[PDB]
Write a protein that binds this ligand. Structure first.
Ligand code: HEM
Length: 154
């Protein structure tokens, strides 16, 4: 799917994320919630967080962000050979929480935005394209695992 060069650009910027998984996770979630507020409804433990400062102060939100970016990091490092990592995540998202593919599109946008905000010198056009392809492949494979479980992802 992705070229070896595209994967290298993906994993190069991901190494920058790993310098501060918590801070990236916070900014991505807060960007997702501000750009698409309906996504905040999937997090009942976050309903009382009304301001950006309250979200940044919530260790719970921070930990949830770290858990997400950790799983995505492990998937990206498989360079497309991620069935074993993607199936449990698809099941969690399709049976417990029911997350539509469109919401995975929303957070992908927030991921790209935060990465370019923090690392423009390591996230120009070729790298953005590479990361977009990797996230597209993630969403496409999650969608197929969704259907396999009987959840159509809408
Ligand atoms: C790249 C995108 C995402 C990744 C990698 C991801 C990953 C994860 C992981 C690893 C868990 C923990 C599951 C477990 O231990 O069984 C989780 C939980 C969850 N995810 Fe996602 N997720 C993503 C996107 C989203 C989006 C966009 C939403 C909602 C808008 C969402 C909602 C949830 C919820 C509600 C939970 C359960 C956490 C809790 O309620 O305490 N996720 N996610």
């Amino acid at each position: 799917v992705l070229s070896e060069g595209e994967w290298q650009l993906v994993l190069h910027v991901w190494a920058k994320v790993e310098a501060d998984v918590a801070g990236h996770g916070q900014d991505i979630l807060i960007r997702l919630f501000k750009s698409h507020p309906e996504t905040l409804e999937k997090f009942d433990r976050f309903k009382h967080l009304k301001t950006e400062a309250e979200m940044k102060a919530s260790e719970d939100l921070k930990k949830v962000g770290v858990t997400a970016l950790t799983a995505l990091g492990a998937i990206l490092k498989k360079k497309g050979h991620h069935e074993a990592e993607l199936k449990p995540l698809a099941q969690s998202h399709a049976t417990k929480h029911k997350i539509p593919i469109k919401y995975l599109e929303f957070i992908s946008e927030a991921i790209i935005h935060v990465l370019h905000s923090r690392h423009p010198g390591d996230f120009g056009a070729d790298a953005q394209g590479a990361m977009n392809k990797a996230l597209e492949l993630f969403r496409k494979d999650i969608a197929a695992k969704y259907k396999e479980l009987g959840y159509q992802g809408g």
